[PDB]
């Protein structure tokens, strides 16, 4: 598997091996691992590492929330390849009043109390731009077990469900906090169309790299829960071509998204539409791609 | 044209009668009309009416502001139908930097002075409000000149299009700047799909009333402009039935999406989710779909 | 759900008693059926109620042919739900040959041999409108494993592929056969935009009255022959509503079918090139849409999954 | 517009010149362009040099009657862009009589008689293999006026479709034809899946070099002949490119059925499928997608618009 260039460049988060250890040693206290050989797993995928490449401008003080939130997401969708879809559904609505603060956790059960904790923790620390996270993570929430997933779905429309089932306004959000970054709703606006750019680039990678995985999970798991449903399969149909092949295409579009990201950031700036709120944003969601696809490359998650 | 029955009761804001002559006299005196009857078709329309059907609990002071708004969009939308789509585009993108203020208007034409001295007087009623009015316009304005017009297009792929054709967004914020209703992120991101729902009836119930209009202008204006793209065509085309037929079944989809509306704010309020100037926002919208309606019925713009 | 007005009159074949008990009682000897609970089912569907719907002015000995091969196209229809399309694909094709009376059935597997014996018989009464069903038949039965199931459509792309999927052309072909009426190719031209049109208010009216069924059977067959591919989902996810006002929407539009049907109809009448032949034919593709709605709003194939 | 790498080797047939001088020469004498500009742009063009390409290993008295065909259906292909659906529907049925030899042409229009001349030469010449042709040229007149171009398509339904509108069946039974290559039922049974997979670098790469020639005409033609119907807009729109970005990513998937042909066929000879009649069948196939390419980046008919 050979990338084609990319003139992106990752950056890491300067804490990350202090950050990693704090947040990967409160899960493997307080989360219910069934076994050694699922910790050291867990450790291998270096949850908190993808997180410093997301968000390498962070606040000191802020990217360990950031690393806990990603961090029961993904405990979570793992978790969700072995439920029906209908048991997916309650798991996740169960976890949206607590997250709101509004249903107190059941403390035997560390999801709920783990989920509970850390949003309280981060209104504590800023409720503002903490209450702006929670309605683009219950997007994302919904769209994991949408029975969408196993209809059939062309290459557009996959796109945009994708957009929901890959967090990209969540992470958006979760960016925003990390950095203290606060953009008016006019600013937001103004870059609406960079941010459905970023999705797919976000989405497709991450199909690419995930593939694998995600291939042996839809023939050994729950048949919806892990059901694959991926840019590789869809344009492997739509082309009547091997996984293979269409990994090579899709990643060629990924390259295009990243020129049309460029782009649309000169003509932002060449307008005089480019804040300075709005050019660490834009490089943000710069960094989140480019760091997205270098743990992609690396982690163990998706090579073993 | 026998229209379902409906739960919705429309509301017309108490100013009507005064503020429909202060604005159409203003347009009457400053806008370039290119003869007595168009300047009779103006009045005949009743375009203030349809903005006080649409926002009637609209504070006193800020409903001419709305008037005036709504009104130069419409006679912009009727000149697009006479360009090509880069004529069209063109004209509409010398407008926009005007209308953010950081150009000043050629004072020779009135649409530039129009739109130049309105949004500066809705920026000096309420900066922050009338601030997250613009991209809405402006995605409204960009989409009346989209190639995807003049391509095949399916119901989904239509409406997805027609949300911003219609202005849902544009028509949204002014409602709230019009009634001083302001939201947070949270609150805003709690009704999208809600808002979604409500794009869906305004443009359809705009496609049916609107039909004869539109297809006279295809048969006698601009090849580019004067394009029909509608939901009467497209569910004839897909069903192979008339266009009248097709509007007796788009008709009852226009009652589904209003029984949706009643659903979907129910849930709302059964979580505990809707706040107070949520409840004000969702009414509102319940206003403009019925109000539109109610103008759509009777407005000479459609009968003659 | 409460369907809405309609001007189109069903009328029911007289024999339709007799003939019910004949051909069920054929099937509940021959087919394999799993256990006692499917010979019920298979009783309460009533598929020769639905053939008697269909063509209530066929021939009186020629209705017996038609209920028996509606009936048994139902079963494998049914079948197919729990195989991959190659499967399905491989199980229909081996159909083929044995429904042309080209190759023997293994007489050890009921399918082929109520195949076989089916159309023998058929042959055996007018050989030159038997023929003329056969690949209408092959049409409709390499559709229904056609992967074009399992990739996106919209509404207009839907109904051209339901056209062969709900088997139009057959029940046509199969229409003409049980009623001995001939047309001449020229005929048969002048109503393709007629027959399209029909083909729209069965492959909805189905639709809507079997989605329950259709629905279930998504989320408990094989992830291919199961594979829910419908009207009430593709208007459902196009306009953002619930399938049950799918339903109501669907209903309507299958309405102004009716009227267009009459349209078209006094159009080619009006033009009288309305043939005494061409006449019959296009009363009888009316009893098949009012005969198909009254079946489906009754049957407990519909009504208890 | 760099093409990325090929390995396949393009060969061109060795009359070209002589062929393409004879032919061109026929239809500037029979055919009526509208002015001196269109005979030039007929002849820049270079229709036989395209069909010398595909063919490579015609025979050498055969390849002249696919340069006569494949011309006036370029020809016809560019007159019904200004023409709605049911006029050039109307215009090509009235041709399809005429080609199978049944009607007479009409001595005062050309296409009817070069279409009927055409026809009886070829029939002269392989009567057999010549009407092998027909149904597959039928098949592709009445794709390119299917209303389907005017209805919203995603990639995989609209590779489908283009299948008979690129003309590949055709394509096959000329390139047989022009070879004397006769093959059986069962041996073109074998090679659908290769025939399916070449009929989409065929469709690709058209669209990718005749795009902003479509483009043009879809703004200036007729709404219906001159609809956008290209892999192109379509795959700009599902991933939100520009056309440019959509023609870069849409060779890198050419390549990649380039790639599956050499697959399949290796597979074919694998398994004990690959007769001598089938072996140059295939490797005909990659000279129709290795030709059309280098024709393709080369004739002025899509770089001079
Ligand atoms: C895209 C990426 C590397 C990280 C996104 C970072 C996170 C955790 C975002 C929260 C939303 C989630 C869990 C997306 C996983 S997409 P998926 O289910 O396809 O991920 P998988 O392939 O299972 O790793
Ligand atoms: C929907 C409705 C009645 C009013 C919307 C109220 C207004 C002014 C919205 C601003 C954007 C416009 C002019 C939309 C017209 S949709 P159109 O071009 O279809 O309107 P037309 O049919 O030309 O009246
Ligand atoms: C259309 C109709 C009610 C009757 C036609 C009568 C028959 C048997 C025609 C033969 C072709 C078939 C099996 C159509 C059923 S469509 P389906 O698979 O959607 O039917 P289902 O909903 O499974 O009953
Ligand atoms: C594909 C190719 C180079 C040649 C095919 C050779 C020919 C003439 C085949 C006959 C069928 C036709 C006319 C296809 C043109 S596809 P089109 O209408 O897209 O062709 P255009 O782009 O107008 O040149
Ligand atoms: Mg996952
Ligand atoms: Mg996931
Ligand atoms: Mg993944
Ligand atoms: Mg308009
Ligand atoms: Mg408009
Ligand atoms: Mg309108
Ligand atoms: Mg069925
Ligand atoms: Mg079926
Ligand atoms: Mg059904
Ligand atoms: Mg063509
Ligand atoms: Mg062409
Ligand atoms: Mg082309």
Redesign the interface.
């Known amino acids: 598997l050979e990338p084609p260039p990319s003139t992106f460049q990752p950056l890491c988060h300067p804490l990350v091996e202090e950050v990693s250890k704090e947040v990967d040693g409160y899960f493997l206290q307080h989360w219910n691992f069934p076994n050694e050989k699922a910790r050291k797993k867990f450790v291998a995928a270096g949850f908190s590492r993808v997180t410093c490449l997301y968000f390498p401008k962070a606040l000191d003080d802020r990217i360990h929330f950031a690393c806990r939130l990603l961090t029961v997401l993904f405990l979570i969708d793992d978790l969700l390849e072995y439920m029906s879809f209908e048991e997916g559904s309650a798991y996740n609505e169960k976890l949206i009043p607590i997250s709101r603060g509004?249903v107190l956790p059941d403390r035997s059960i560390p999801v709920e109390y783990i989920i509970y904790d850390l949003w309280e923790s981060m209104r504590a620390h800023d409720r503002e731009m903490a209450?702006?996270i929670?309605?683009?993570v219950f997007?994302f929430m919904r769209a994991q077990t949408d029975r969408?997933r196993?209809?059939?779905?062309?290459?557009?429309?996959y796109?945009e469900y994708r957009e929901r089932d890959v967090g990209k306004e969540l992470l958006a959000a979760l960016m925003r906090f990390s950095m203290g970054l606060k953009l008016?709703?006019?600013e937001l606006?103004?870059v609406?169309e960079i941010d459905?750019?970023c999705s797919?680039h976000l989405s497709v990678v991450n199909d690419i790299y995930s593939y694998e995985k995600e291939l042996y999970t839809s023939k050994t798991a729950h048949?919806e829960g892990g059901i694959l449903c991926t840019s590789v399969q869809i344009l492997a149909?739509?082309?009547?071509?091997?996984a293979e092949?269409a990994k090579?295409?899709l990643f060629?579009?990924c390259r295009?998204?990243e020129?049309?990201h460029q782009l649309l950031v000169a003509r932002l700036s060449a307008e005089?539409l480019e804040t300075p709120g709005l050019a660490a944003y834009v490089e943000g969601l710069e960094y989140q791609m480019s760091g997205a696809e270098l743990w992609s490359q690396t982690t163990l998650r998706y090579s073993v």
Do not use: I
Not at 237 to 242: F, G, L, M, S, W
């Open positions: 509004d209450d702006e929670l309605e683009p997007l969408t196993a209809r059939p779905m062309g290459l557009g429309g796109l008016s709703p006019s606006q103004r609406r459905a750019n797919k048949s149909q739509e082309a009547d071509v091997t092949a090579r295409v060629v579009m295009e998204w020129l049309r005089g």
